[PDB]
Design a binder for this molecule. Structure first.
Ligand SMILES: N#Cc1c(N)nc(SCC(N)=O)c(C#N)c1-c1ccc(OCC2CC2)cc1
Lengths: 51, 333, 225, 286
């Protein structure tokens, strides 16, 4: 009943940032932690526990 | 009555107002990953029927598997040994979980009861510790927060927060119209997402108890959901052979992963450790690897002889475990 | 090279494997049947959630799930390897009949049940006879094709029954048979049966039409049928 | 010696083809997870027996037919090893036929009766019986009393014809043929009844197709095995025309019997759906 239109009100008040800032943040996080991703770049077989 | 349309249009144009540029125009400069090859290091056998769920441990050493015989099996990822084989009461289960402390396991299915099993006992055997009997529909997935709380999603268009010692639920989320099929937590352990059968997704609050944001953009059923490592995005998969990436603060979609040669559906979705690789389990008897930032295929993990229903990446990024309906598990590295 | 703890774990693994091997033989020698129906159909008394019975030293397992709602498109994917689906329908209630037919259309055309056969049980026929003998029956109102219907000569009427009861029974049988032969091509079939409230021969019927399906499948796998 | 050289050439061709096909089948089974069923174990046993015939029996048969002088037991050894593998193949065919009969005529109890352990035991007993049957001549059923002509290596100069007729043919070959014929007649009748039920001109076409498919299996076995054992009975029962018979008539007969090793994979394995699916997947992936 009135609960749906009541609930939509707080969804209306949320402020939104630009898409560019979020994309830049995603880019920065992905590029920063690229040295500790064994799946993206393989590790030497000496330290690999699966062999 | 008629105010809902005006509010929805206001939301629609408010979202469009903030859209500046797409991810493609910003990612057209980074170097592509290339091609990724993966091989099966270990093959795990011992089940008789289809495998429905799997969850890695916190130490990247142990994992638990659930099948249609009503039997949970705890393996060892290195030596391919078996530690525990717990038989269940109801043979129809469709979920499993592993406690973050390595002391408890969770299970549920069509029997509408959530079962908690204790592992580190003083007698060497496994016994039922607690049973939760509040829901009015079949359970879909349950996840742990600590050794005293659990979050469950069932088929009665509701989600529930429980307290193990007290035994009764403390908070219920009732904002959906169709039965929920998947949910995922967040690293900060304060918000969690849910995807239901009404072609929509929602973000909830653990302590507020009310919904905050809703997302739409799919045309059919939403099967599996995941969460980004940083905490500001999540990925969704649907039966349209479509994955979609949803950002948290802009309240919009960012990218869509799809192809013209894929007709079947999607059963499981997972991320990598750095957030660069997105693994998807399709219904054409093989999985797929996507680059989350460029929308380009990187490889195919085609080694199964039936439907793929499981997927998971360790906490250290070492290997990825895949289950299927032929009672076998595979570990790729 | 191998420490004591590793061998201790290996012994436990061997014990677990032995137990699983013991359980496999029991699991592999049981035929599973899925029971479906609606409320006020008498599914409770045919042979509340699970039932185990054996006939001629052959085991069976019957599952009856009813804690869900009208929509069942989700959890029906699990039962893609059951031997047969038992469907129980009522014949006394005339107005709540077309809906039942629609329910059957949902099962026969589901994408996950292409190679699963259906055994049909028309129940509550003693009530049907009492309702059709009395003047309260108005079949032409609910179904206006029944007035011009004719008794099939291929039928096997039970001696001592009025022709009206035979017509009423066989019209309802043919209504489901039309849907049964409307679609499907050599993958699954329908077996109609007439069942009363206190019948005792259901197990033998299930045994026979369960043997037939397995024989047909085995004949098909060698490309003879 | 043109005919003798031609016989050896065709024997070598047959052996090479048999080993190639049966090794292909065995490798296909070994590397497929979905093909590890109790039914396929008998097919693997048949393929292994055919490999053994192709690689070992054919050179031994050529060496026996060459006709050089050596000792007695050394020459009997080759004949015994020739006999054992063929007997094992004969038994494997009967095992497969019995498996199909159980699969069709008793469908509800098929799974409770046929399992991995029982299949392994059946294979073990079947292979032990072949060794027992082939090693009978070493017990004393020989011809050293005459010692033929230190002895010229011919099959007829070591193993007597009474052993070939009374013990081998009437004791280890004919009853399997009768059992397979009866089993396949019963299967055909069962198939025809269900065809009649399901139908209610195409029905007769399907019945004819099923009859042909079932009859070819027995026809191949009979055509491959009967001519070889007919000549021994002709020679033993009446010696008049047996003494003066064409020399080549035997050789082709022997060849025909070895042909059964190269036809078995096509009839039993390649026709099955699972094998075709596995072959297609392997070809596409690699
Ligand atoms: N008889 C005879 C005979 C024979 N007179 N010569 C040769 S070899 C020299 C040659 N070219 O003639 C061979 C050979 N090899 C045989 C033979 C072959 C197959 C046999 O399996 C019988 C089956 C039931 C199990 C038994 C015997």
């Amino acid at each position: 009943a009135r609960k749906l239109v009541e609930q939509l009100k707080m969804e209306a008040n949320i402020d939104r940032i630009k898409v560019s800032k979020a994309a830049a943040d995603l880019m920065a996080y992905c590029e920063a932690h690229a040295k500790e991703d064994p799946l993206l770049t393989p590790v030497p077989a000496s330290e690999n526990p699966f062999r | 009555r008629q105010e809902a349309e005006q509010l929805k249009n206001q939301i629609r144009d408010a979202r469009k107002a903030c859209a500046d540029a797409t991810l493609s125009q910003i990612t057209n400069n980074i170097d592509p990953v290339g091609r990724i090859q993966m091989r099966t290091r270990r093959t795990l056998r011992g089940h008789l029927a289809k495998i429905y769920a799997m969850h890695w441990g916190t130490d990247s050493r142990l994992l638990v598997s659930a099948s249609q015989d009503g039997k949970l099996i705890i393996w060892d990822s290195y030596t391919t040994n078996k530690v525990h084989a717990i038989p269940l009461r109801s043979s129809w289960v469709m979920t499993c979980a592993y406690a973050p402390s390595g002391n408890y396991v969770a299970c549920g299915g069509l029997d509408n009861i959530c079962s908690i099993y204790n592992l580190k006992t003083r007698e060497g055997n496994v016994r039922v510790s607690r049973e939760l009997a509040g829901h009015t529909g079949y359970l879909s997935c349950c996840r742990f927060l600590d050794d005293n709380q659990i979050v469950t999603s069932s088929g009665d268009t509701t989600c529930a927060l429980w307290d193990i010692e007290t035994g009764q639920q403390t908070t219920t989320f009732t904002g959906h119209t169709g039965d929920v099929m998947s949910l995922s937590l967040a690293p900060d352990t304060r918000l969690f997402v849910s995807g239901a059968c009404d072609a929509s997704a929602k973000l909830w609050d653990v302590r507020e108890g009310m919904c905050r944001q809703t997302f739409t953009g799919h045309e059919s059923d939403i099967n599996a959901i995941c969460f980004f490592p940083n905490g500001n995005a999540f990925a969704t998969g649907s039966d349209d052979a479509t994955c979609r990436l949803f950002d948290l603060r802009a309240d919009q979609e960012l990218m869509t992963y799809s192809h013209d040669n894929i007709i079947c559906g999607i059963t499981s979705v997972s991320f990598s450790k750095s957030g660069r690789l997105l693994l998807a389990g399709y219904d054409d008897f093989n999985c797929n690897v996507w680059d989350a930032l460029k929308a380009d295929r990187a490889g195919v993990l085609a080694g199964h002889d039936n439907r793929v229903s499981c997927l998971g990446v360790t906490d250290d990024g070492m290997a990825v475990a895949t289950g299927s309906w032929d009672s076998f598990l595979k570990i790729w590295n | 090279t191998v420490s004591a703890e590793d061998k201790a774990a290996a012994e436990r693994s061997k014990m677990i494997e032995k137990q699983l091997q013991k359980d496999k033989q029991v699991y592999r020698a049981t035929h599973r049947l899925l029971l479906l129906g609606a409320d006020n159909s008498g599914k409770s008394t045919i042979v509340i959630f699970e039932t185990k019975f054996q006939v001629d030293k052959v085991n069976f397992h019957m599952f009856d799930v009813g804690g869900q709602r009208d929509e069942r498109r989700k959890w029906i994917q699990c039962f893609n390897d059951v031997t047969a689906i038992i469907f129980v329908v009522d014949s006394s209630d005339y107005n709540r009949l077309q809906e039942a037919l629609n329910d059957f259309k949902s099962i026969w055309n589901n994408r996950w049940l292409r190679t699963i056969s259906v055994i049909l049980f028309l129940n509550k026929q003693d009530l049907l006879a009492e309702k059709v003998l009395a003047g309260k029956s108005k079949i032409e109102d609910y179904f206006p094709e029944f007035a011009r219907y004719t008794t099939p000569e291929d039928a096997t009427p039970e001696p001592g029954e009025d022709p009206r009861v035979t017509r009423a029974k066989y019209f309802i049988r043919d209504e489901f048979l039309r849907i049964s032969t409307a679609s499907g091509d050599g993958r699954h079939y329908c077996y109609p049966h007439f069942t009363c409230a206190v019948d005792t021969e259901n197990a033998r019927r299930i045994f026979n039409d369960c043997r037939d399906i397995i024989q047909r499948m085995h004949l098909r796998q060698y490309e003879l049928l | 010696e043109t005919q003798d050289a031609l016989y050896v050439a065709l024997e070598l061709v047959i052996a090479a083809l048999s080993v190639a096909g049966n090794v292909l089948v065995c490798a296909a089974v070994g590397t497929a997870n979905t093909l590890q069923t109790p039914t396929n174990y008998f097919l693997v046993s048949l393929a292994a027996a055919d490999v053994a015939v192709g690689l070992f029996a054919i050179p031994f048969a050529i060496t026996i037919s060459l006709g050089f002088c050596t000792d007695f037991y050394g020459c009997l050894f080759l004949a015994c090893f020739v006999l054992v593998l063929t007997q094992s193949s004969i038994f494997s065919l009967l095992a497969v036929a019995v498996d199909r009969y159980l699969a069709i005529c008793v469908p509800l109890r098929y799974k409770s009766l046929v399992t991995g352990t029982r299949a392994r035991g059946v294979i073990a007993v079947l292979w032990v019986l072949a060794f027992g049957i082939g090693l009978t001549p070493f017990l004393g059923w020989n011809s050293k009393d005459s010692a033929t002509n230190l002895v010229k290596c011919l099959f007829e100069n070591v193993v007597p014809m009474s052993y070939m007729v009374y013990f081998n043919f009437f004791g280890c070959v004919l009853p399997p043929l009768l059992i397979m014929l009866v089993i396949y007649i019963k299967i055909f009748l069962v198939a025809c009844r269900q065809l009649q039920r399901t139908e209610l001109r195409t029905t007769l076409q399907r019945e004819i197709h099923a009859a042909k498919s079932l009859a070819m299996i027995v026809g191949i076995f009979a055509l491959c095995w009967l001519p070889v054992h007919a000549v021994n009975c002709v020679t033993l029962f009446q010696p008049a025309q047996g003494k003066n018979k064409p020399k080549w008539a035997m050789n082709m007969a022997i060849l025909l019997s070895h042909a059964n090793s190269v036809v078995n994979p096509i009839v039993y394995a390649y026709r099955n759906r699972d094998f075709r699916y596995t072959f297609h997947k392997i070809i596409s992936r690699y």
